[PDB]
Structures are given as C-alpha cells and as structure tokens.
Amino acid sequence: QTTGTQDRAIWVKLLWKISYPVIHNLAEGTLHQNMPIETRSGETAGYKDMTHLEAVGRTLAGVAPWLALPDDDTEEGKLRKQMREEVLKGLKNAVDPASPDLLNFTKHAQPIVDAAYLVHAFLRAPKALWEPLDEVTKERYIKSFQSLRDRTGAYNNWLLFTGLTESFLLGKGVQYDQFRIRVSKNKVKEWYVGDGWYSDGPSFSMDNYNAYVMHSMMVAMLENLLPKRWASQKELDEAMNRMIRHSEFCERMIAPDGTYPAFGASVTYRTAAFQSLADVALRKKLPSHVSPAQVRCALTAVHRNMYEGNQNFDKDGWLVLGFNGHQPECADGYTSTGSLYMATLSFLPLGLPADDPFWTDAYADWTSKKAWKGGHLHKDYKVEY
Amino acid sequence: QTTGTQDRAIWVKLLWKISYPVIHNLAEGTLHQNMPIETRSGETAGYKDMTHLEAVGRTLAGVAPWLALPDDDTEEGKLRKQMREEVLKGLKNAVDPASPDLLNFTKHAQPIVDAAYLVHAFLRAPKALWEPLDEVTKERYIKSFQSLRDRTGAYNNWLLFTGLTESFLLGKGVQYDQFRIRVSKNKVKEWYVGDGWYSDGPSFSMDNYNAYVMHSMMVAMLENLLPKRWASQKELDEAMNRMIRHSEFCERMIAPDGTYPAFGASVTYRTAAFQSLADVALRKKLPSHVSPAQVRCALTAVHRNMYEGNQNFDKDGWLVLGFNGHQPECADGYTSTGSLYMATLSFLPLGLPADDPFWTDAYADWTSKKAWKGGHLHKDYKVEY
Amino acid sequence: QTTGTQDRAIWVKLLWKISYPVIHNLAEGTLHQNMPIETRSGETAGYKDMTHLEAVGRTLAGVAPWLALPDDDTEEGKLRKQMREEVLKGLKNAVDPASPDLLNFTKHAQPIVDAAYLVHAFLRAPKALWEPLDEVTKERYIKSFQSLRDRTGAYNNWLLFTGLTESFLLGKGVQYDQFRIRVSKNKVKEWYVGDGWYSDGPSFSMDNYNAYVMHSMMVAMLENLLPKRWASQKELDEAMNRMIRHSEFCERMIAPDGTYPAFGASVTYRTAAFQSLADVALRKKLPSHVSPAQVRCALTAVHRNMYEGNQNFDKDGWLVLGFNGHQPECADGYTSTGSLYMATLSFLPLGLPADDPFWTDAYADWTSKKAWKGGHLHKDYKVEY
Amino acid sequence: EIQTTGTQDRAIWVKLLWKISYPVIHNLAEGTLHQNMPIETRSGETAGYKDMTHLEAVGRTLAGVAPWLALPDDDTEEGKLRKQMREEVLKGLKNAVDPASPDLLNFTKHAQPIVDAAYLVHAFLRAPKALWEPLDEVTKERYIKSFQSLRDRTGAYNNWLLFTGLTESFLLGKGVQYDQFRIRVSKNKVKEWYVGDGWYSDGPSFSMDNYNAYVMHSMMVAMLENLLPKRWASQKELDEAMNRMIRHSEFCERMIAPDGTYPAFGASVTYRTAAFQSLADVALRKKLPSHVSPAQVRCALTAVHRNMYEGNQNFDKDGWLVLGFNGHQPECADGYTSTGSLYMATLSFLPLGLPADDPFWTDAYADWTSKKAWKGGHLHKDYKVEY
Ligand SMILES: N[C@@H]1[C@@H](O[C@@H]2O[C@H](C(=O)O)[C@@H](O)[C@H](O)[C@H]2O)[C@@H](O)[C@@H](CO)O[C@H]1O
Ligand SMILES: N[C@@H]1[C@@H](O[C@@H]2O[C@H](C(=O)O)[C@@H](O)[C@H](O)[C@H]2O)[C@@H](O)[C@@H](CO)O[C@H]1O
Ligand SMILES: N[C@@H]1[C@@H](O[C@@H]2O[C@H](C(=O)O)[C@@H](O)[C@H](O)[C@H]2O)[C@@H](O)[C@@H](CO)O[C@H]1O
Ligand SMILES: N[C@@H]1[C@@H](O[C@@H]2O[C@H](C(=O)O)[C@@H](O)[C@H](O)[C@H]2O)[C@@H](O)[C@@H](CO)O[C@H]1O
C-alpha cells in the first residue's frame, strides 16, 4: 500500500508525536512542570528525582540520527531544523543551575543509566547536538558525567552504561577512567553466550535488553576506543557482527499483522525492542538475507500499530505505562513516565537520507510475512562467532 | 468464535490429517513403497535409509498421549481405538524381518535420533503402545535400541537422545549403559544457560530445539531415573520448572493472528516449536497466570493456520518441505519428508480427557492477543532457577 | 661421588628390590598366598579382592620400558631376560582360571584403575610383554578389559583410566567403546587449569596426581588415537607439551639433600610423584636447561633415599604403608600393600639403553642443588599453553 | 647441640630481619637512600628503575617489619631495638613525602607505584598505632593524596588488581575519599580466580609459583578486613579467604625440606623467603592448623632464615640485597626486578609480631613436616579440600 516516501512521512509524524513533548517543554523549562510522573505504585517520591533525565536522555538517543542530517529546505528539513534548535535550547537549560528544568546527576544511582543514553545522543549526532552548545554548557555536561563515578560500582549490569560514558570523555579529550572502560568492555565480552546474544549480567535471559542496551552501546563504546588504540578493529568487528546477527531474530519476530511478542522485563520500552535492528539499518549493514525495504515496511507496521492511535498516549500527549494501551500492571517498579521514551530507539533509520535505498526501494514483505504466505523463507542457522 | 469442545474436534481432525498416512501405511506395510522422499537437493541416497524411522518415531512421539486415554463408546473413542490398533500392527511390522516395512536401525548414525522419539511414544503411552506388543516384537525393539551404541559419540546434541533411550532400557529391567545416562544427565545440566533455556550442545542458539528436544526429553529421562534413585526429586523438579518457564516464552510468541516467528534451525518442524508448551499443558503444570483455555485457544489458532489448509501437504496428504507453504529453500541438508513428522509434537494436550478444564473452559485470549488489544498484560521477568 | 654407570646399577637394584617380590610370586602362583594385605585399619575384607591387581598392574607399568630393551650378555642384560620371562609367565597365570593367582576384574569398581595401569605396561612394552603372550591369554585380557564397562564408577577422575583402556582396545583392532574414549579425551582437556597442571576432578588440587595419572595416561591415550584419525597431532603436541612443563616443577622440587615435599593425597605412592619427569626423560624431551644427567642424579638421590635402606620394606621385602618408613597414619582408607607399587613409576629412564647420554653423561647437580649452592639458576616463568 | 632454643630463635630472627632491613630504614631516615642504595638489574640498565626502586625498597621492607613494630615498648634489649628502628621509620616516612627531602619517593611516574603503594599500605595496616598514627598531620595528608593519585595510571595488568583494591580499602578505613568500584572489582575478580585447594590464579592464567604467598592471600584477607565493618564484605567472604590462606600455608610449611631448604620454582624466586608470607601471616594470626604447631613453623623458618641470610651470599659489600636466590645469581631476575624489588624478603618475619612469651617462641624445638616424614616420624595424611 504505502510507498517508501509515505513511510518516511509516517515515521516523521510518529517520531514527532513521541519526542516533541519532551524536547519542546525542556526548551521552555517546563518539563518538570508539565510531564506526568506515572508509576505502578503511584509514588512520585524518588521517581521525581530521576524521571526527567530518563525522558531527555532516551528521547534524544533515538531522535539523534535524524537530527544529524544536513539541513535542507524540504518540508521535512524545516522540521529537522526546528527540532534541533529546540533540542539545543533544552540541553542548555538541563545544565543551567538557574533553570527550573535543571536535571539531576547526583541524587540516586539511576543517573548512571540515562547519562549513557544522553551520551549515545551525542555520539549519534556530535556535530548537531554537542558541538553547537556553548563551552560553559559543554563543561557542565563534562563535569556531570564525571560526577557519576561515586555510584558506578553498583548493579553488575549498568557496567556498560558507564563504559559508554567514560569512552565519551576519552573521545572528548578530557579526564576519563581507564579502569571503568577496561572492566566494562572485558565483562560484556565475557557475557556473550552465543548466536548474537549476550547476557545482561551473570545469568542469561530471553528478553529485549540485548536491543535495549547491550549491542548498540557496546559497538558505540568500542568505536570510541578504536582511534586511541584502546580497542582493536578485530573486537569492534566482532561486536558489530554480533549486533548484525541479533537483528536477524528481531526482524524475524515481527508477525504478519505487524505485531511482535511481549516477553521479558520492561516490555514498557515498546519499540526499543528493535534498536538492534534499527541501528544495523542506519549503518547500512543489514544481513545479506534481509533487504532494507522489508525492514522499513516491518518497522512501519510496528510503528503505526503502536503509535498511530492514542492507546499508548494520555490526554496531553505523553506516553502512558503499558505495552499497547494503558497497562500499568506490566510496568516494572523502577519505571515512570520518563523511562518510556525508550520508544524512540527504533527510529534510527531516519538518519538515513530520504534518498537512501532504505526509504526509496519498493515495498517488501518481511521474513515472517513471507513465511506465512508461502513465499521465499530463507534457511536460518546458528552462528558460532 | 469456536468452543472448547469444537477445539478438541479440530485438533483430532488435524492430528489425523498429519499422522494417519504414516501410521496406516506402516500398518499395511506400504510405508516404504508409498511415502515420498523429498529433500532440498532432490537426492534420495542416504535419506532413504533413515527417513522412514524418522516418520514413525516422530509421528508416534506426538500422538502417543492421545492414545493413552481409556476407551469410550463415543465417536472420538472409535477414532482412538482404530488408530491405536494400526499403530500396534505397524509396530509389529517395523521390526519384523519379513515385512517390507522393516525400519533401519543399523545403517548410519541418524537412527540414534529417531529411536529416541519412538522411545518417547512408548514412554508417553506404555500400556497402550508397548505392553500390547508381542514378546518377539518387544525383544526386537530392545535389541535394536541396544545396537545403537555402536555408532554413538559426537558428544554433542545427540547425547540426550541416547540418554533417553538408555533410560528406557533401565525402566524395562534390561541391560543398559549407565555411563551414557550419567554423561547425558550431567552434560545437559551443565548446558543450562538460564531463564528456561539450555544450549543444545556446547553452543547457545536462539532456536526451537529447546522445545524440539531438550525440555521434553530431559524431563522424561529424569522421570525414568527417579524410581531407581539414579536421579533425585530435586533435579527432576529442576528440569520440570525449567520446562515450565520455557513454555512461558513459547505461549507469548503466538501472535494475535495465530502465527509465530520463524527463526533458527529446522524451522521445517512447524508446531514442534510448541512441544515444551504442549508437554507442560498435558502435565497440568501451566504457570498459574497462563490459563489452560488460553493455551487451547492459542494452539488452536496455530494448528489450523498451519494444518487446516493444504499449503503444507502434497497431492497424497503427506507433509512437504517448508514452513507454511511448499518452501524447500528453508530446509536443512539433513531434512527429508519423514523428518517433518515432528509436526505431531504440539498435540500432546489431546492426552488430556475431553472433560478436562483445558478442553471445557471458556474461550480465552492468549497473552499476545490481550497485550495488543489493551487488556491485562502480566509482567514478565527473568528467573534465576 | 658416583658415575652414571653406577647410577644405573643402583636403579636396577632398587627397582629389582621393589618389583621382583610381586613378579616372581605371580610367576610361581603364590602372589595371593604370599603378599601381605596391610591397611591403616588393619582390615582385609574387600581389600583382598583388589590389592593383587593393584600390585601387578602398578608394578608392570613401571618396569615395562626396561623390559622393552633388546637382550644382551651383560650382568644387567641377564636380569632383564630373567624378569621379562617371569613377567610373561605371571601374565599367563593372571587370567588363567586354573591358576591360584587369577586376578579379579569383576568385583568392585577398583579394577578400573589397575587394569589401566596394566594396560600402560603393555603400551610401553608391546613387543616384550603383549606380543609373546599366547592367543588364549590375549583374548582373556581383551574380555577382562571389556567387562569393566558395566562399572562406570563415575568418580569422574577414573575417566582417563577407562579412556586409556578403551584406546588400548582400539589399538589392538578389537571392539572398543567410542563414547568412553571421546568423553574422557574431552574431559581431561576441560580440566586443564594452566601452567602444566590439570585438575584431577572438578576442582584443582596441589598434589602429585598430575604425575600419578594425568600426564602419562593422557599422552598415552592420545598416542593410541593418533593413527586412527581419532585425535589430531595438534592435541597430542599440546598434551605432550603440558607434561614437559609439569616435569619442570617436579625436577625442581627435589631438594639439595635428595628429598622432596610430602604433600597432597596419597603420598604413599612415593617416587611415583616423579612419573611425569621420568616419562619426559624416557622420551628424550627434557627442556633446554634441564640436563638429562641432572635428572639422573636428582632421581638417583631420591631413589636411594627411599629404597636403599629398609625403612619402607617389611621383613619379607614387601612395600609397607608409609612415606619414608613405616607410617601407616598417612595412608588413605582405600590403600593397601598392593596399592604401593606405584613406586616403580619413577624408573622409566631405564627404558633408555645404557649407552644413552642420560646414563653416560657425567655427574651434574640438579636445579635446587645448584641454586642453593650459588650456581647458575635458570629463570622460571609461567607458560600459557 | 646444633639445636637452638626458642629464645635463641627469636634472637636469630631479630639479627637477620635487622640485617635485611636496617640499610633501607636507616638510609631513608638519614635522607641518603637515593644516594647509597644500589640499583642492580640483570641487564645493568638503571633508566626507569631509578624512578621506582626506592619506593620498592621502602614499601616491601616496611610490610615485613611492621608486625614486629606493633608490639608495645619495653626495656629489654629487644625492646630497645624496636624503639630505635621504629623511630627511624617514622623519620624516613616523613622524608619520603617531604618535597624538600632528597629521599622523596616517586608516586607520579610509571605504573609500578600501584604495586609498592599497596605494600606500604600493608605496613600501615599491620601497625596502625606504631607507623601511621604518630605521623604529623601534614605527612599523613600527603600519603593520602599520593595513594589517590594512583588511579590515573590504572586499567593495568590482569594481576595488580588486588594492589589497588587494598589501597582503596585503606583510604576507606581512614574515612577519606576512595573509589568503591575499584574495591568491588578487585574483591570479585579475586573470588572468581580461586581455582581450589588453597590456590588462586593471579589473574586469568593459573600458574604454580609463590605469588599466592607474595600477594594473593595476605592482601585479600587484609582487604576484606577493611571492608567488614563498613557493610561492604560479609563475614562469610572474610572467613572464606582466611581458610583459603590457612590451606595455602599447609603446602608452604610442607615444601621446606629436612635440610632447611625450599624449592626454587616459578616467577620472581628472587623474593626469597616471601614464598612463606602465607605461612608467616597465619602464624602471626595464630591460626595455624591443628597438626602444624607454632614451634615447628618457627624451627622450619629458622632453618630457612639462616640458610639464606646468616651468611653473606645474598648480600653485597655494603649489606644490600643482591639479585639472585641463594647467592649472586642475577640470571634468575626478571626484567622488572631491581635492588628495591628484593626487600620482599621481609615478609616471612611477620611472626616477630608475636610477643617474646608466645608459644610460637617459647615452646621446645619441634621437627617440621618434611623433617619428621623423612626420618620415619608421624606424618599426617593430607587431602585436597573443597572450600
Ligand atoms: N532498579 C534496578 C534496575 O535498574 C534498571 O536497569 C535497567 C537496565 O538497563 O538494566 C534500566 O533500563 C532502568 O532504567 C533501570 O531502572 C536493574 O538494575 C535491575 C537488575 O539488576 O534491578 C533493579 O533493582
Ligand atoms: N545429520 C546431522 C544433523 O543431525 C540432525 O540433528 C538434529 C539436532 O537435534 O540437532 C536432529 O533434529 C535431526 O534429526 C538430525 O538429522 C545435525 O547434527 C547437523 C549439524 O547439527 O549435521 C548433520 O550431519
Ligand atoms: N576408592 C576411591 C578412591 O579410589 C582411588 O583413586 C585413586 C585415583 O586415581 O583417583 C587411585 O590411585 C586409587 O587406586 C583408588 O583406590 C578415590 O577415587 C576417592 C576419591 O574419588 O574415593 C574413594 O572411594
Ligand atoms: N612490569 C610488569 C610486571 O610488574 C610486576 O608485577 C609483579 C606481580 O605481582 O606480578 C610485581 O611483583 C612486581 O613488583 C611488578 O614489577 C608484571 O605485571 C609482568 C606480568 O607478566 O609484566 C611486566 O611488564
């Protein structure tokens, strides 16, 4: 039905619908005032100290590739530029000690996680979202990222979060902790179990956290370590090839009706279950059996199944606790309204230009859709790397 | 739409459509003459020595619980008594040296696999499928199961097959290889990676072999080792809970349209991907937030999406290579027509009586269906056991 | 003080003091009649079913290389011929059910250990101790080794014993168990911990069992599997190289006074603690900076510290429970008089001819002797292989 | 005859511990350690070594003499020697971080200071009242900053992790800023590296050498002790390392030969009797196992002490340690070993930190295990443990 160009307009519309309340309010210093703090228990204490950074860091981590595109004068180009300026205005506010939207980095341990997503935003759009900020704003982000070191010894997983962050400071040529990078890189490698899956900690689990955290961030950390001879091209390649393998499962779990199963912890992160697939696509490294077009069509179906209606939004435009609908019963205890903005992490292909094959090739059936209609189903097999 | 009593009727109709060509031809001694030998390459050499025992063992492993029921006068009862007699007659012919449907145990290593599935049939229905056999037939199977030690080894993902087969021999009071049972038990425990998942051999894959082989056989073997103190109630509970946890994911991977992802090796085994769910349901051990009726309805959707139409059958009603359609391009090199009769393994809940709540309870949306329409969605989390 | 030629005359004399009471009695049919059964508890029930095969198989495995030499007219050459002939005679009585000295292979699991040692004798001197046996005697040994499989014994550190035994059956072209060879080969490798040390079981231990069993039997098993493509040359070099490393520690723990530490389990096996050193010496594969002569002089000092006097012998010339003297308190509960004939296992260098540099090169201090007196001391360091 | 008493044995250990350690301690007090201490290396090069070897001499020396100095003062001839040497130590410790002093020690250059700061920290942990508390507050703060400046050179070798962990636990104990993450990682990596029967691996690679005595056991236990009161390491963990050390000491006590030698094997045999720090530490804690008595440990290590220090074969013409094992044998020195490196030799004298009236020093002579076994005496059965 819809074309690649129409698909892009859909993604733009849905990505705007998710991310704009976060970005715009931060730009107006009203994010604390206007964003709900919805929790399963209903308690806001504790949550209120951490939830805004989660919203900013997760929102920008997903919109960043789109905003890294060169400006132009298309109807989309206007939107990209309007969004980017509001983002930069927001980031100055988030570290301005005088702004009512100043973001917490010191109370609680949770800031470790979401500074990593804010760093991923920067690593995905450095020329668009980091460099234009003024030097005092840059310094505050440098100091805020460094201040996280008094809590990083905490949760076993969360190791990679602070590795990503320290490798960000290494790549910005300021003080960084070699130890936290060596430990986290080496532990993520040890946590590989096979066939494109790590464990997020000592015990393996079948959940979406390989796409939520592990694959995208390990590659991004290793890329930072490479130029300084801290990681080798061989272990960058090994992590990259493992993300490419993990994406095959993610593409294959999209059903013919454009749904995907709800399993494991934090199903409230919705389409961030596909960040592995989305990152691989943005890097033009999709597996050989998978055409870009079928990734665009599958994720377009998932996107409109989950964000075109308002089942996942409240009366003022914010994401509500749930999976597809208002389902607070499925939210983990650490989840609040801010954490839900993991939703953006499937929209990374927007960082491909509008003239990329991914957005221009004719519609294509994705794997499961071919499988169930008697079409060409490729053989799949475990990999040993 | 349909009621539980209709769902039972559909399952019987569809299990009949899968297994009757195999059981009837073997009973009449024309299984070799009539059954196709389809392969991805088109060659029949090698395959023709092993494909028939594949069809017989794989089929019986799945239909055995249904045939363990006591006899009734009802229409369904007439079907059961009729099918059971043809299995008994076919089992006689299969080790009769004069019958043209003599099956191969002695050439190649592959009879190791399929002897284990045939053993499983005997294990799931001893009084209905084993005790009625004549003494000569009994000793012939005992001898041929013992002749399999000659090939053995690979130390890999066939090891659990021989462990099941030697545990059968132990349960029957005959000579058996204690070392093979011990190595299979300890190695399968050591291959547990977590959250209900084993690795099949020393290599983790994300595929259906946990359903195809691991959970159902490990539990069945331990149950054979329990009476004689070769396994403990502790390690049996361990495997039982591991299978139950695994079933949680399989139930959740049924999409609202009654489909499920195609991923990993041997996707050609179709609904065998749900044996772990089917075995748990038969044992009345579904995790208590997963109702028996919603398992019945979910697998009714999968069962007729794959078997009610003929996209998976040739002109004579045999299974063909593929997933949903004739798709020989998804088949593994080792796969042939008889391999496909794994398809029976999701029908084990027909071993539950017609008045069991599994077949009599109200219609119920399975987990994905509720999740995507905005109904209750039970939170999930990784387990440590 | 003493020359190489005299050193050899001492090894022959002391080896004769140890091995002849076992060998001569077995040849005369009087081993059961004459050999004591000494135990820490003083009990003999149970021990009396197994101690005799312990004595034979442990004794032969140490004298075998000496007996593999070709005959000559020298004072020492006449002794080899006399001993080999008594060994052949004893071996025929051993499986002769008319002989009073028919050894037990059927009661208890212990036969697994000592059959393996008996097998090691044959492997070290095939031409001299196996090939001259009559055909009925050869077949009885084949049946006796095969009849052990019913007793796994588990213990998991008896795996190498059955693996060596089975690989001996393969080496003779008769029916062997593949599975047992494969599992024992792969387990010992899994049990490598580093730096020339295996763990003899799940956990590492600092004891002499690496020299009692692991290295010599692992190298010997692999050498059997090499012709039949059953193990690669690379995994034979690996095991060989690990033994050569281990021998360095054993060479170095011989103190300047010709003692060595008493430590770990089963110190009652006495100079068998040097079996890896002795086997490396026999194979002319000592490392660069370990002279063959210094191994000769180091082991000569140990050999007469323990065997020249009578502290370790009883009034009848049999080994007694102890380290150096009658010290039954250090015996394991499973140990009896027969167990003690592991003491032959440091005498393998007599498998080198008298004209070999090991026996003709002039005296030389050993590593600890040189170091404590101030001479050259080569840098040691851990190895990675 | 040749068999000494317990009172004599303590005197011999004082004489010998004094022969090793007084050149280092007295020169640092005088401020002439850089001037006078040799810098001996197998190659002969001094570049790089001269930046690290002085802290090596200081930290290693102090970690071995520290228990002796923890004893309260008295007016015996030995109590005089402790008072004098202690006061020189506090003098040398002031010079060591005086920017004015010429014996100022390096903490900024190279990675090696991580190692030797840890040994110095271990002296402080073994005699807090005697070597740390009497320091002026300026000198104390200076040490704190030097220990904290070690984090910028980090993410170093597989091993060395225990060193930084002990250091960070020391800063934890003093109530000053510490890196909790470096503590969490070194506690857990060491727990993962246990292979069994009393042996860790020093990093991912297992090796049969004396580094379980050199570093592993004493610093693991000493680190967990700092972690216990602070709700950061359980009694279960601390007793676990403690029993593992007691098991390790059984092998080390057993490897002493009847003639009073021990085998040279594995890396850095140049550390000489540091191969007995595990035995020495367990003897000092009075947690020897049931079948090894304090007397046989004293007598065994008295034989070892004077087989290597009574004579001058390990000393140069000025009383400095030379490269080797028992003699001038520089060919067994690793490339990282200098003259400072060799003052690990003090770590076997920990039992001098038991008072002169302890059973360790008062009980009659007693053969040690190997000595008893080779002459036909009681030999206790050994067996691998599972803990
Ligand atoms: N609160 C702990 C929990 O923290 C959660 O971790 C997530 C992750 O990526 O691991 C992150 O997405 C989320 O924002 C954060 O709240 C997590 O550490 C688990 C597992 O140890 O335990 C919870 O106590
Ligand atoms: N024939 C080999 C093949 O064996 C296949 O293994 C499957 C399994 O359990 O993994 C089993 O379901 C199937 O019936 C059996 O044919 C397989 O082991 C592959 C590699 O895994 O190599 C083939 O030679
Ligand atoms: N009897 C068991 C005991 O067997 C002993 O094992 C030794 C070995 O090689 O492991 C062997 O040298 C000796 O002949 C044999 O008697 C031992 O396996 C221990 C530990 O598993 O348990 C005892 O019951
Ligand atoms: N410089 C490296 C070297 O450092 C040495 O480590 C020793 C240890 O504990 O392993 C320590 O005793 C010594 O003071 C220190 O200089 C060592 O890490 C080795 C590792 O093989 O490599 C050397 O480059």
Residue numbers in the entry:
A (entry chain A), B (entry chain D), C (entry chain C): 21 to 405
D (entry chain B): 19 to 405
What does the paper say about this structure?
To trap a substrate complex, we crystallized the inactive R285 A mutant and soaked crystals in chondrosine. The loop containing Y175 was modeled in two conformations. In one conformation the tyrosine sidechain is oriented out of the active site and makes interactions with another monomer in the tetramer. The other conformation is one where the sidechain of Y175 moves over the active site to interact with the galactosamine residue. Y289 is positioned in proximity to the O4 of the glucuronic acid and may act as a catalytic acid. However, Y229 is nearer the C5 proton and thus we propose it is more likely to perform the role.
Here we show that components of a (PUL) from Bacteroides caccae have activities consistent with comprising a unique pathway for depolymerization of chondroitin sulfate, a common GAG. After prior desulfation by an endo-sulfatase, BcSulf, to produce unsulfated chondroitin from chondroitin sulfate, the depolymerization pathway begins with the activity of a polysaccharide lyase from family 35, BcPL35. BcPL35 activity is coupled with BcGH88, an exo-β-uronyl hydrolase, and presumably BcGH109, a confirmed α/β-N-acetylgalactosaminidase.
